[PDB]
Amino acid sequence: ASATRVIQKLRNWASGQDLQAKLQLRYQEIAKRTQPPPKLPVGPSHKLSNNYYCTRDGRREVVPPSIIMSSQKEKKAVTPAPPMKRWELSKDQPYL
Amino acid sequence: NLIEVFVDGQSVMVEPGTTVLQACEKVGMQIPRFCYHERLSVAGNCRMCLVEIEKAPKVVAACAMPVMKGWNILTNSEKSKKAREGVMEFLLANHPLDCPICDQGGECDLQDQSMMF
Amino acid sequence: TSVKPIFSRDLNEAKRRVRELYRAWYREVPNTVHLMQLDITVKQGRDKVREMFMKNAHVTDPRVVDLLVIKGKMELQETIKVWKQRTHVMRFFHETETPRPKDFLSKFYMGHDP
Amino acid sequence: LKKTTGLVGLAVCDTPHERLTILYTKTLDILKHFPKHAAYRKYTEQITNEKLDMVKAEPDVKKLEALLQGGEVEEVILQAEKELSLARKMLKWKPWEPLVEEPPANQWKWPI
Amino acid sequence: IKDRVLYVLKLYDKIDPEKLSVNSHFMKDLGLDSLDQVEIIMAMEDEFGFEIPDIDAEKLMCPQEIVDYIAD
Amino acid sequence: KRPTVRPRSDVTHKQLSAFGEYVAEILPKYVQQVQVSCLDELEICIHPDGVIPTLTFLRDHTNAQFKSLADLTAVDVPTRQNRFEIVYNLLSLRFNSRIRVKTYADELTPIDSIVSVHIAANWYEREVWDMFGVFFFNHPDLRRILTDYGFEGHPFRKDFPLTGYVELRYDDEVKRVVAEPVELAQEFRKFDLNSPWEAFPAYRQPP
Ligand code: SF4
Ligand code: FES
Predict the structure, then answer these.
(1) How many domains does chain C have?
(2) Which residues make Cβ contacts (< 8 Å) with residue F138, sequence separation at least 6?
(3) DSSP code of A37?
(4) Can you give the residue ranges of every domain in chain D?
(5) Ligand nearest to the CA of residue B99, numbered in listed order
(6) Which ranges does the record mark as transmembrane (chain A)?
(7) Using N-to-C axis directions, what is the helix angle for B78-92 and B109-116, rounded to 10°?
(8) Binding site, annotated residues of B for [4Fe-4S] cluster
(9) Which of D96, E5, F126, F180 could form a disulfide linkage to D38, CB 3.0–4.6 angstroms apart?
(10) Which of these, E72, E61, E70, lies nearest to E31 by C-alpha position?
(11) In chain C, beta strands by DSSP E
């Protein structure tokens, strides 16, 4: 930014765009360091009641699988899951 | 002479003068323990060995209670897990924070039972 | 007993393949010690070959023999289509290793191996 | 109308519905070789029957496609050819037969 | 023929200590191994610009039949 | 609902179960131990004598279109006769789904390849043969890909240790880069971690 008006004009004619508005370097366009000591929140699990773990066990709701056609233990044509819904173009720039 | 039990539906044959805990062992499900050691006498101080007894409302202590024919036991049920949660909250109320210093750091039955149950 | 075979049915077919492979290695070695500027003699190379063969002579299973054959063929491909180098090929001779003393007293005086 | 598909390795097919009738009729004519107690027949029969009904009920591709709800017509044709080959191969194999050889017991047991 | 065959044998490393006759049995009269035998047959094939399958190469455990084959 | 738990839905656990019954009744042979996991996945165990039939079926049959072999893998469990577990993770687009095929195998019991169908396996099979020791027929090029061109053994098993048997170093005495036996400096600490107290009373195993 410390540079000259004519050089600004020249580089801008060369490129095609503007640069003083979208520079890459950083002239006080940042957030100051030495930020203040913050205070934080907690989750919905820091209550005092109705927080019994048995409700939200998490890794005990798991249950082993449900086997089918083991070796010891009319109809329609089906699939593993419904098909894929075809996509559509965008509202902004579908071409390029 | 034998006696019958139906744990979680699963059936078991045992002797009299027996204990809920020795039955659950015969089956495999380990029951918690603080005041029990097969090579000692028995008491009911800790109060972490609690379970649920279908057809009867009140919980019991599986380190002292002798099993009565026909009882369906329930170990991992609601009342049991809640009893254990409360009991360990109580214990750890005052157990100081010397886990690091405590030479019994990685073998602490209480550490493990808190982390799990 | 009642099992499934691999590439063969008996020690004899296993051994005909093995002999083909011996022919390959024997007819090959010179090309190696001539392409990669080695030092050892063709005779020493063939000695190593026949030794690596003899050291699997307590074998009975055609499956084992055939897997060993497959691995030997892989290595032969690797060699003749030169990918292994001087190092890759001389890694056999234990050229930087004191022959493990089998003299019980040697083992005693030196270390703890029984 | 059109100029291309949107993929690579495909073609602007100008003779649809005809290749489709051909391929589906041939599938069924092969299925004729299959014992009725083979589920592959018992299923793909009706699948192809419904596909034929759909091509006959919709003559324009730009709607037949979205109706089949599968890929584009060329993908459909390719997949039908693939099912044809699959049939010719399951005919040499005897899958509908019972099981080959049950495994040992502690094989599918996880944990361990 | 036989002359250059016996010369090859005399040349071979661990063979021809005393005998390289035309009739001997390699694995029986000389008490040798299939590996060494294959070495012999490879030497012969390279002498004669010839090719052999391992099958008949092992069938020919007898110098007489060996020279019969190289004649054939 | 609770914040710290995913939703265990029904749509998938039902659709994939229907598809499992489907494939089972189609291939009463070359199949055993179908199953659906508690987390919306399908596994299909099969004899090694049905691999290519199963794969061709799943690639071609319209209702499956399991085209892309997203992965091929091995696993080793030594407490059984057939100790290796070969795994194929497959993907289909039209139906936006995945699937898992398993087949047991063993050292000294090779397998039938699939290169005719999914050319991706041409290299996963090389990996397998290099690392574990499982063999594949009808494979054009099968050679050590990852490890050295002279390496010997089968590392990704559970017996071939971590550190390995040999180390390398240069020895000016010969100027080469030779391989000598492992004499480490520090020892591989092995921390005993498995805690006794059972946490999962549902995956238990009685005597
Ligand atoms: S490790 Fe266990 S015994 Fe030691 S201080 Fe912690 S809770 Fe107490
Ligand atoms: S184990 Fe202590 S009260 Fe039962």
Answers:
(1) 1
(2) F112, F113, F115, F116
(3) P
(4) 1-112
(5) 1
(6) none
(7) 130
(8) 95, 99, 102, 108
(9) D96
(10) E61
(11) none
